[PDB]
Each structure stands twice: as C-alpha cells, then as structure tokens.
Design a protein around this ligand. Sequence first.
Ligand SMILES: Nc1ncnc2c1ncn2[C@@H]1O[C@H](COP(=O)(O)OP(=O)(O)O)[C@@H](O)[C@H]1O
Ligand SMILES: Nc1ncnc2c1ncn2[C@@H]1O[C@H](COP(=O)(O)OP(=O)(O)O)[C@@H](O)[C@H]1O
Ligand SMILES: COCCCCCNC(=O)CCNC(=O)[C@H](O)C(C)(C)C
Ligand SMILES: COCCCCCNC(=O)CCNC(=O)[C@H](O)C(C)(C)C
Lengths: 266, 263
Amino acid sequence: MKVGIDAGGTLIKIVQEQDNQRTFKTELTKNIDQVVEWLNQQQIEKLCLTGGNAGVIAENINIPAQIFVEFDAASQGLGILLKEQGHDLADYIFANVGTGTSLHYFDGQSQRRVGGIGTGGGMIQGLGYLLSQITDYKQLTDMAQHGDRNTIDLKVRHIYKDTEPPIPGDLTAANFGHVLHHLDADFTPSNKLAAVIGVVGEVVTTMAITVAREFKTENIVYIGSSFHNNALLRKVVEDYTVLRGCKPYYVENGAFSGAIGALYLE
Amino acid sequence: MKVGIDAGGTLIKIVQEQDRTFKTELTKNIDQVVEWLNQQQIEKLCLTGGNAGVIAENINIPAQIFVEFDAASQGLGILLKEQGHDLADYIFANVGTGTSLHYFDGQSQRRVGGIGTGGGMIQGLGYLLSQITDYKQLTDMAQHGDRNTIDLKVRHIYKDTEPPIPGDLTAANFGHVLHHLDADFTPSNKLAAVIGVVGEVVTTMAITVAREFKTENIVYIGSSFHNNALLRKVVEDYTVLRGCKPYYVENGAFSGAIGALYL
Ligand SMILES: Nc1ncnc2c1ncn2[C@@H]1O[C@H](COP(=O)(O)OP(=O)(O)O)[C@@H](O)[C@H]1O
Ligand SMILES: Nc1ncnc2c1ncn2[C@@H]1O[C@H](COP(=O)(O)OP(=O)(O)O)[C@@H](O)[C@H]1O
Ligand SMILES: COCCCCCNC(=O)CCNC(=O)[C@H](O)C(C)(C)C
Ligand SMILES: COCCCCCNC(=O)CCNC(=O)[C@H](O)C(C)(C)C
C-alpha cells in the first residue's frame, strides 16, 4: 500500500494505492487526530504528504514521510487525471477552489502560480453561516440550490434602463447591489445563499478568464472540493467561462489532484 | 453655464462649469435632478452613465450622450494632470456600484475586465449583515471593525509549516467564521470583513491586469472610497505589497461627469 494525503485547511484528502486499485477518501481537518491514528495502524510502503496540515500529520506519525509543495503536487495529480479521462490539453489555467482559491498556469510541462483570491469554499461556509446560521455543509449547499438571486443581484440592464449598454446587459453589475431596492422583500436563506455562491463563482471565474487571456490559453480547469454537492457553483462558473470564450473543464476526483500528485513525485 | 452629468446606478455626479462646481445627488432622487435641470439656463449639457437616458427623456432641452468608459478616461486624465501626476500609462479601476477596470496606454483606454464586487456589494451585503441602510452610518461603523475572528490567513492553514506564499495573505474571506462559533460576530467586525473582501477582490483584479499590460501604475476612482478610509487602506496596502503604485484622485468620482464636458 502506497498513500498520498492532501491535508488542507478544511478537508483531508487521502488516496490509497494497492496493486493499481485506487481508493479515494475524505475526512475533515477538524478530525486530523483520527487520520493520524488510522495511519499509525497501517502497513504503508510509501507515504507522501502535501498541503498546510501536512506538518501536523508528519510530526504525530510513527513512520517517515516525504512532503511536497501543494502547487506542484496538484499540478502533477491533475495531469494524471486529465490524461486518464481523455483530455490532452496542450496548456491551461487551473483554479484550485478550496478553502481559498489559488490559480495556476500550466504550460505543458510545468506550472506556475499566477494569482489567488480568498473567495472560495471557506467563504461559502463562513459567510453562508453569517447569513443563515446553517453550519452543516450539505444542508447549506442543498438550500442554496433552491435559491433565487434576482432581488439580490444587480444586472447591467438594471443600471442602463432603456439604453443600449456598452457591455452585455445580462451581466451581473453588482453582487448584492439590488438588496437596497427590495427592502420591502424578506430575504430568504436560499436567495441569500445562492448570492454568496453567485459572487464566489463570478470572482473565481473572472480571475481565471483574466489570467487565461494573459497567458494566451483558452483552457480553464476547475478543481477543489468546493464543487461537491454544489451544482449551482459549477453552473455559474461553467456558464460564465463559456460566455468569455474559454473552455471549462471539471475532473472526476479533481479535489484529490494534490493527494495523487504527492504519490507520483520523487 | 456648461454641465456634465454621470448618472450612475447609485449616485448622480454633476459638474457645473461657469468660466467648477461638484455636486452629488442620489439616483433614487433622479426626479429632482431633472426638475433642477429644467429650470436652468444651460449652454451645453453632456450626459453619461446608465441613467443618462432616464434624464435625457425627461428633460425639455437637447443633450449629447457619451459612453461612460471614454468619459471616465478623459475626465481622469484631466484631473491627473491638474493634480501633478504625469503617468505615461496606467490601470484604472472605477469602483462604483460595481467595478470596471481599464488600461490607459498614454493615448486611449481599453476595458480589460470588470467584477460585481464594489460599492453596491458593500451597501447590499452590508445591509444583510447589519440591517443598516444609511451609507454614512454603515461605513463609519465598519472603520474600527476587527477582521481576525472572521478572515482566515495563509498562516492559519499552514500552522507551523513554511507556507509557499506569504503567510499574512488572506487565504479565505469569512474562512475563520466556523472556528469562532462561540464568538459574538458584531456588526463592525462583519462590516469590516465585507469591505475587506471587496477591497481585496478589486485590488487583486487590478494588480493582475497591471502585470498583464506591463504597467506598475494603478489609479483607483469611484464614490466607493468616500467616507471609507478602511477601503482605501486595504486597497492601498495590498497594491503596494504587490509592487504597484496606488493613486487616488481629488474628485475622482466625478471623472465621468468631467469627461462628458470635454468631449
Ligand atoms: N464535507 C464537506 N465539509 C466541509 N466542506 C466541504 C465538504 N465538501 C465540500 N466542501 C467544500 O469544499 C471546501 C474545501 O475544499 P478543498 O479543496 O478540500 O480545500 P482545502 O484543501 O483548503 O481543505 C469547503 O470550504 C467547502 O466549501
Ligand atoms: N451618499 C452616498 N449614498 C449612497 N452610496 C454612496 C454614497 N457615497 C458613497 N457611496 C458608495 O458609492 C457607490 C457608488 O459609486 P459611484 O462611483 O457613484 O458609481 P455609480 O456610477 O454606479 O453610481 C455606492 O454603491 C456606495 O458604495
Ligand atoms: C492581506 O491580504 C492581502 C489580500 C490577499 C488576497 C490574495 N490571497 C491569496 O492569494 C491566497 C488565497 N488562498 C490560497 O491560495 C489557498 O487557500 C492556499 C491554501 C493558501 C494556497
Ligand atoms: C451573468 O453574470 C455574469 C458574471 C459577472 C461578470 C462581470 N461583471 C461585469 O463586468 C460588470 C461590472 N460592472 C461594471 O463594469 C459597471 O458597473 C458598469 C457601469 C455596468 C459598466
């Protein structure tokens, strides 16, 4: 058994490999203690680590472990999964949408971090909590799928009324920009949660299409756990990427890219 | 008397020249602006922005209408020169109800992006997190707010481990909320975090296109800065951290109204 772990701020991603049979496992970072305990019981041929909490794991385990930088690990695991799933992309931006978001340009051989932003999954949970008092992730994200953004968000055509706008009128002009025109409306947790995701989705995508243009690629690969159980977040990201003339790609087990990469390095 | 008006989604910016007067009125009160205009003797009336059409239809005199991007660019160059800046090139980030970003190459401008994180989000999300609707009050309240229990930093995730980017960077806006559920989230802290996120998104976008178009100059404008020192500081600090020069402009929010006049 060989093992790769991407110990992030919110989720611990574990890949076990055994005779080319692969296991994909998630555990909360909150429960890192139980991950360490599990590890100490196992017969492990090779253990590779990455992410911010790799150190916490490495210190509390009884066996050696190689530790890799998460940007390189994610890039390598993602290329392994892109190949396996029939994509041969000469180059691409990838947007690792986790607790926060890191953006990368892969030129065909290697990656470079070209930006990042703190709009990501951690904001969906945290701001989500402030607007709804829901702490359970599944519940939070389910509820948001049932949401309407029209009373909350302001569109380019809302500002330009009956004039020809100088950019497409369906574009979001101001996230939460309509709230003050609907104070005679009672803002439901679904609507509000849909608008949190709405803004997170549009910020990530905008950043991604911008660096796609800068590094002269049309391919944008979206990964990270922020997409699990959140179809609304995919749709927002997908629709807008397309609107901007770029190809969006999701990846089966994209959130484990870092755990896989750690396995297939050095 | 000549008049330029930038009728935005939230604020109507009026410049009167009689030779300069700078006046603001709420877009909600556009009716009173139209009434004021119909009483006046105006040699030339130039209009720009989204609500220009609403004004133009309800007035009882002619009016040239310009596209806001070209107007803002022209007015801003006038103000830059007047205030002693000779910038060969620059990004400008018009931070209004929403945010539009531009690259000025020394002779003309081009829109290189935009985002819906801006002043409208400060007000709107601000309202949702505090039930304050008054802008002055909302922004005053945010000013000494503390973000540390709300935002998550690179070093919080890389707890005792060398991070691969600077550890003081915000990693996740609102990303700490779930680690402080025992804590009272006060309206100031929460409002400081709204502005925090809006400031960091605008700046990130602006420094990114600054790099792309190989300029180190970033000029920030729009009314979103008025009575919000915290929003300037967040934007300013991070721009500097990224190796770019931030610039604010006296009456930068009127750039569009001025530009309409001189086109
Ligand atoms: N089971 C879950 N519990 C909490 N968050 C989840 C879960 N599944 C998906 N998420 C979302 O994914 C995010 C974590 O993404 P991930 O890419 O694993 O980031 P990190 O590597 O920083 O832990 C969370 O902030 C949340 O939005
Ligand atoms: N007196 C005010 N009333 C309402 N909003 C204000 C005021 N002063 C500043 N603001 C802020 O300015 C933003 C509008 O910026 P502005 O550049 O005037 O854009 P627009 O052209 O879309 O009206 C508002 O969204 C709000 O954040
Ligand atoms: C003081 O903060 C200035 C604003 C910084 C905002 C930009 N922040 C970032 O680029 C970090 C975003 N987050 C990430 O990249 C990821 O969550 C990691 C795990 C930190 C890599
Ligand atoms: C359907 O949603 C599209 C995703 C949001 C895309 C980006 N939004 C924008 O570029 C609009 C930002 N707003 C602005 O530039 C200004 O407020 C104007 C006045 C509308 C020009």
